[PDB]
Structure formats: C-alpha cells, structure tokens
Amino acid sequence: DDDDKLHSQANLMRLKSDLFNRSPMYPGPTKDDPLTVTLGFTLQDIVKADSSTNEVDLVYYEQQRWKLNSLMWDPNEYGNITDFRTSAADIWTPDITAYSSTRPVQVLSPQIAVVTHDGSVMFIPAQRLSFMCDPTGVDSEEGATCAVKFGSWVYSGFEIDLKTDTDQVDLSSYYASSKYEILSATQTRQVQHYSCCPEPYIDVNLVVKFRERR
Amino acid sequence: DDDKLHSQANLMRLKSDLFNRSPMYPGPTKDDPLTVTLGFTLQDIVKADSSTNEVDLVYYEQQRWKLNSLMWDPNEYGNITDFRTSAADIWTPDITAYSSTRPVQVLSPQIAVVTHDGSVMFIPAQRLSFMCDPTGVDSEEGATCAVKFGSWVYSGFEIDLKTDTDQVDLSSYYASSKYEILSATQTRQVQHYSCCPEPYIDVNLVVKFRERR
Amino acid sequence: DDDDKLHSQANLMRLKSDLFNRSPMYPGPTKDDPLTVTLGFTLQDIVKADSSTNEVDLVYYEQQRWKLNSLMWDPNEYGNITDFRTSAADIWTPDITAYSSTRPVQVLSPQIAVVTHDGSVMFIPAQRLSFMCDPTGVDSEEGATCAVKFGSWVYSGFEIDLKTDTDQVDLSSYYASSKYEILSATQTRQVQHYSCCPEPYIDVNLVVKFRERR
Amino acid sequence: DDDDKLHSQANLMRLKSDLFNRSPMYPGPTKDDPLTVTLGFTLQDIVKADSSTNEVDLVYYEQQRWKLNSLMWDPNEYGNITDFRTSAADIWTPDITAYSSTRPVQVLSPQIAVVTHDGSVMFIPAQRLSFMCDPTGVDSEEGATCAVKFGSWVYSGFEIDLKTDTDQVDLSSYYASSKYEILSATQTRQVQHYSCCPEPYIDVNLVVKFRERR
Amino acid sequence: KDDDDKLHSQANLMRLKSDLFNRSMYPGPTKDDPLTVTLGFTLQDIVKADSSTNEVDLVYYEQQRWKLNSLMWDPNEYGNITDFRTSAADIWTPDITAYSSTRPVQVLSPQIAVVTHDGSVMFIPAQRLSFMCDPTGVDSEEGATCAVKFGSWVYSGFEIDLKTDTDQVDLSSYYASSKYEILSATQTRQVQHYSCCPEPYIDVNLVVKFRERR
C-alpha cells in the first residue's frame, strides 16, 4: 500500500494542474460576477497601546471564506479528493485591508489556503496590526474604545460583498496574561462612501473595548 | 453558472489582449507626455519628533492617468467597462516625496482600476516620515510643514502633474489624533534641479497643525 | 589526479536533476499520504522580556525531520552518494508556525537542508521569535512561566503529524551570560481543535520557566 | 496622432530589447577596460545625531554618472530617441559604498536611471545613512566635524576611478529648519590602501561640519 | 587604437564568464571533495551594548577565501585575463554564519566577489551583527569580554574546513572615536560537536574584550 499513496498524489497533482493551467487565473470579481467574502476575527492579544502617538497594536487572525465555481470539481474524478491545501499565491485572494492602519500589516502565518470540491476557499492570515486608536481611559473601569474597519481596498460593493457569521469577535483564544483584558469586541458589517468613487464600499468594522489588568 | 463563465472568459481575454503585444508600454516620453492627477486624503499625523524634526503622516494619495494603450471598446468584451489589476501588471507613475526621511510604507494592496477609456486610477495608502520642524505645535498658531510629491526620474516634458483642487481631503482625518489640522493644501509647483536641464513638477503638500486640547 | 572530483560532481548534478526536474510531484501531504515531522528545540537565549507589552524574545534553533519516498535513491547508481545539501526552496518544507507569535519570525540561518538516500530530510532554521508571554515574576525565586506552541498552520492531524524525540528542550547551547537563566524548558506534543475546521491539529508546545540571573 | 505614439513606443521597446535582451550585458570594468564614475552629493538633512552610540543619520542624494560603450546607439535607427529611462536592474550600476556605515543604506527614491545615446548613464539614488560619527561639541559655536567615505567596495583604482564635479557638497537643498545647521560640507577624491588587496582604492570623502541650530 | 582593445578585453571577459557559469557544475563541498575557507575579521566599531537584553552590535568586515577547481582558466585562452569581479550570486559562496546572533545579519556592502585564474575566490562582506553578550563591567578598568563563533551552518568539518591567517583581529580600522575602546580581539579556530549530527563542525571564535571610553 505504498502504491495507493502514489495514486492519491498522481491525482492531486492532476486536479491542481487541471484547475490552475486550464482556463488560467480567474480574473477577480466583476459587477457581472459579484463575490461575497465571509470575515471572522479571532482576537489573540492587544500587544501595545502607545498613548503618545495614539496607535494600538493587535494580534489576531482573520478568517476569510469565499466560493468560486471556477474552483469546483467532482471528487469522483480525482479519487475522492474532497479538498486540498495550496499556495495563497496560486489563487485569487481577496484584498481585505484595514482602513485605520498606520504601519504595513505583518503576516504571522504561512501563505496557504484550503480549497474544497464545491469551490469554497478558506484562508486565515494571522496578522499584527498597528492602527489609529486613542487609548485614553485604558486605566479606568470603563476602559477605552477603539475601532478599525476591514474591507476590500479596490473592489466596491457591486464587486465584493462582505458578511460576518456572528457579531462576536472570537475571544476564546485571547491571551490570558495580556497587558490588557477585553471588555467586548464586535465585528459589524458597514457601508461607507468615499470621495474617490461613485459606488458603495463594504467593510467589517471591528470595535474593541479594553482596559489594563489589576 | 453559465453567464458568470462568459463574463470571465471575456475578462481573461481583455487582460490577455491588452498586456500582450506591448508587454510594457515603456513609460512616457517627451514625444508621449503624460499628465497624472494627484489628490491627498490626510488620515492622521501620527507622530512629531521634535528632537529629530521628523513628522509622521498617514495619508492616501490618489493617482489618475490616461493611456491610449489601455483603451478598449466595451462591445468587444461584452460591455466590460473596467477591471481591477495588479499594480505590477501596468506602468505606474513614480511619485516620490522629496523631503522624506525613511522609505515610504505602503498600507494598501498594490492594485489599480483600469477603465475602457484607458484611464487608470490608483490609490496607495502610505505612512511617511518627512523633514518638518514641529516647533510651535503647542501654540494657538501651531506649526507649518511642507513636503513635495513628484516624479523622481521624469521631467515636466515627460510627466506633468495637476490637482483637482487645492484643499487636501480632511473629511477622513482621525478625530482623536494627537494633532488637529488647521489647513492642508496641495498645490502644483515647478522646481529646477542641479542635476538636469528640464523642469520638474511637484505637488506640494502644506500642513498647519497643533496638539489636540 | 582531479578527475575523481569531476565524477562525484557529475553524479551529484545528475541525482539532483533526476530528483527535482524529473518531478513526479511532491504536492505536500494529504490524508491519503500523511506525513510525520519530528521537532526538537535548542533554546539559545531569552533575549528580551518586555513587561509593558507582555512580549518575550527567544532565539532558538528548530530541528525538523521528515521522510519522503519521493526523495529516495539507491546510492549505488549515483556514485555511492549517501546524502547532499540543497536549497530549502528546492524542496517541500513543512509550515511549522508559532501560534502565540507577535511579529513575523526572523530567520538567522541559511535556507539549506540535507537529504539522505532513504528520503529522510532534516532542516534546522535558527530563529528570533517574539511571543505573548507575561514576564511578571521574572525576578522572584519562582520565576515566570511562558508557553509557545509550534504546529502546521494549514495541515491538520490527518495530513501532518508531529512527534518529539525528547520532552527536554536542548539547553546545552543556552547562553551562559544571558539576562535570564532557564529553570526548565519542555517540548510536549498536543492536540487542539479550532473554530475554523472540523479536524484536530497537532502542535508541539514549548513551556519555558525562567528568571533574571542572580 | 494615435500612431505617432505607437511608433515612438515600438522603437523604444525595440531599442531596449536590442541593448539588453539581444546583447550580452557588459561584465563590469576591468583593469583592461577601466571606468570613471562621477560622484556628487546633495545633502538634504542631518536627521539624528545619537551621542550614546556616536551614529549620525544623513538624508542626501548621490548623483552617479558613468559612460558605457555597450550602451551607445544610433537615434536614426530608433525614431530619433536621444535617451530613455529604465530600471537600475536592467543595466550595470557601480557599487559605490559608504565605508563607515553602521546600518545598511535605506533607499528613499525609485530605482530608475537615465541612459543617453552616447552611452552615458545617470543614476541618482536618495538615501538615509547611519554612519560612525562622534557628535561631541554639536552644541557649541564651532560645532562637530564628521567624515564618511564613498567608493567602490570591490573594484580598485585600476577598475573604477572617481571624479567629483566640485568639492562643494550641494547644500542648495539642505532643510532650512533642520535641527542642525551646516557649517561646511566638502567632497574630496582620495586614495586608500587596505590589507586585503595590493592596489589602491579610490573614494570620495564627505566631510560635514555642523552644530545644533541656534 | 584603444577602442578595439577595450572591445576585445570585454568580449573575452564576457566569454570567460559565460564559459565558467553557463557551462562546466559546482554543487558545494562534499566529504568526497572538501574545501577550506580562510576567515579574517577587520573589526570597525562596537556600536551598541544593550545591558537590558545583553546584546552587542558590532560593525566589521569578514574576509572570506576559498579555491575552486571549477573556477580555473588559462589566461592565454582569455587574453591574459588574470582575474575578474562578479556577483556573489553567480558563484558558490560558503554559508559562514554567526552562532550567537540575535538579529539577522545586516549587509553593509555590495555582494560582489573576486575570482582569480587559479580558482581562488575572495569575498569580503561588511556586516552589522547583534549577538548574545553580557556587557556588565563595560564601564570598568578591565571592561567586559565577549565571544561570537562564525562557522558553516550546514557543512561539517569534513566538507568545509576553516583557517585564519592570524589569531589577531584587525583593529587597524577600529573607529578611533567609538564609544568603546578595544582591549583585545582574537580569532581562534575551533571544533564543536552538536546533538543533531555525527561529525565535528569547525568555527572561528571571535573574542572581544572592551570598555566604554573614559
């Protein structure tokens, strides 16, 4: 049964080939082919809050899900391969960007996604973000409140739509011994209009109330 | 399903037919001058280091230009009016801050939008450290600083700049920033440099600011 | 005279060619072809502990080992070459990622591995890591305790399995005059489940007890 | 004129393709075929003088100019194209290096150079340099005084020679409101010798005298 | 006259280089076919000693020297070309790495090496290194004392050997005005053994004894 191993790999190498070098590179969404990306935020730590610049440093991971008929296949032609991991470079990925960011976002996780036979893609980049947020109040019972919104930078609402599965930011993995404890963190979808462009823009707005321990 | 398949067969076609045959339109020439429109939305003045006289801004810079070479007719492609593309896939203008003091930091996806008339728009969100003496930032008057943005390699006869208005966009300036803005103006300038015979256009960003109170 | 050197080289260039550029795959692990990676940690220095952000900086090396039938050769027909060094780019390498990390990991070693005729691969990246770690207690007899877990970020337990050779993290090479002395450092295998995914995920958890030297 | 821009381009695209793609790119100067770069500095600002490490940070741009015969063409064979801009990684560029630098040089500007028909090339990289410089006295009448030498790292005086246009640094762009006032800034050709190598090495010595701006 | 002579000299060096790389190739040292690098340090400056992390930052240049068969030519087929400069990435270079480093080494110089007709290569990368080093006592008569060993990361004592030209580090270029005076600096050949692997590994041990100025 090392022969069995060899087939499962002949097949995966074939599925991947037939997908990525047959009808090459899906060109991103268009008005005519809109795409909805599901966003979820696991907040792990509020690393730093610089009260003299009003920047705050978060480490989270952001879970992204979309679906593409172009990534669809029947397992029964690929030997019951239901899914597979691939390089995030190998496929179109959504350009989800933090709007109040103040340094380039730092990737903490491997650039790899998982594609399923229904053409559904899931991708979870863990990131360190520095964003505009005024920590005044972080040492009072009330704490301080901060927001940062995540959305497509280039695609409108007619091209990319966003939706969350839940309002509650995942705090189950929040670092126990963090300098700051979480009081609430909500992921909410929003529409904004910008002075650049006629169309609306979907973002998911992350709102975090927090304070120092003791 | 079916209709989706076509509008992507088309997009893959347009993209292909454009970027191949002239892989690289090779940039402007005196023969083929190009004007790029600049706008600045100021988001935040993060930091003002009075000990080094560096100031830190976070803004985004909106760039627009036009290229016959990116021109196409919607009816050739099933009414595709425009599309998103990688910023590496196309020629982009080399707009550089002149009094910058650290490499500019890109905060946005490197992607642009191309329209059927061959007009391109691109908006890099940037964090900039530039030369600026914040003395006065703690007085009613505040402190004034300037930093000029312009092509680094292309002259006025190759790239020209113009702004659609002189007021820097402050509608999205951070409400709880350490510094409040008093005025921010984007104005076109001509300078000459000791390096080169021809004139060089820059858009000069002028910002008066003071500490929030 | 010197001709012998020339053969050993023709033959290494041949083995490498026949392996890499006459492919037959390696697409990474799948359920049908699971892979077990051996992890070992040599802890070199606790560089910094920042009490105000609850971040700690470690310098270690991470010894990885796996096996691949696809990298297997009969040395007889390659001038009796038993192994060779290759660029880590030139092969599939496991995506072993620190979960509590707070800045991207810093590579301190050459991006090179050694492959043996049995298809066994060993790769030891030296790294600087910053992770969520609360140093409170670092200046008491007891010291402070911190954990960081290392695992595949994208491959589950059905694709990648992890195993240590020993529970003892290697302190042989730990800096003598480091700001912090180690009181124990244990590498222990674990299974977690995550909100993202149906299947379990293996990680090796590094647990470090430390305090300020005298 | 639609076509009068298609021709201009096809020519430039072909011109470039003739010089690099079709031509074997020039292997740097030799003792047998030497080369003179002409260096110039525009000093823009002394950003930081750190008297706890004796590092000073300058921001300046360095005008570089050399002539290559491999880079000559006939504007008659390319629709009268007297010159063009191209990326610095398409051509050979001199390795002019700061000798007393303490942090790898930071590029403030795009990596693009201008080539003219007679083969002359100009390159103006803008940079930030941390170099070894005791700033004691920077708060007195007479100020402090600092040197940093630029010159080829690898090529000696028989491969690369240096010229300046003038031994006055370009203070025309010095930041009027800089922490530091410039008192003098001179650039001078020099010959050194080092242990490594038997020939002499040519540098241009930048010497700044400055004080904290009253 | 000279226009032709410099077109010949170039065509030969263009040819010679394309003879050595674009044909004839060298896959690093083997036990079969070993190699000795000769290391030498010119220490230039101790920039920073951070007593809060026990990190020291040196700025030095490292002279590397090895000899390769695959790199020999006869100047009479290549018009008396005794040597040439070429990019480090066109030839094999040793992976001499700092063992006690805390931050990835920073390259202060261009990556170009010199190859002579007898196959010998010289490569002098200039570097900024942060390494593990308790600087206590640095403000006393007797100062502090620190070691950092450089040596191959992957290659054993049977693939790469090391030798130094002298046990004295070059302080003839030490920054006369640095925050730290050097009291001694010696480079010493050493053999280590590690858990990971069976054979000896050779390093050169750099040992610096230093104090703050006055």
Ligand SMILES: Clc1ccc([C@H]2C[C@@H]3CC[C@H]2N3)cn1
């Ligand atoms: Cl494609 C993808 C992204 C993220 C993940 C997650 C599952 C485990 C836990 C976090 C991360 N690793 C799994 N797969």
Ligand SMILES: Clc1ccc([C@H]2C[C@@H]3CC[C@H]2N3)cn1
């Ligand atoms: Cl190419 C492009 C088009 C539009 C934009 C803008 C839309 C969202 C909000 C500001 C910025 N991102 C940015 N880039």
Ligand SMILES: Clc1ccc([C@H]2C[C@@H]3CC[C@H]2N3)cn1
């Ligand atoms: Cl290749 C090149 C040509 C010209 C220039 C110059 C244009 C602006 C002003 C001085 C410098 N930057 C810079 N680089």
Ligand SMILES: Clc1ccc([C@H]2C[C@@H]3CC[C@H]2N3)cn1
């Ligand atoms: Cl390949 C090579 C040869 C020589 C050098 C040296 C010559 C000058 C002085 C030190 C360094 N720069 C550096 N690299």
Ligand SMILES: Clc1ccc([C@H]2C[C@@H]3CC[C@H]2N3)cn1
């Ligand atoms: Cl492929 C490989 C082999 C061996 C090693 C190790 C042996 C010496 C000590 C640490 C590192 N260098 C690291 N990587």
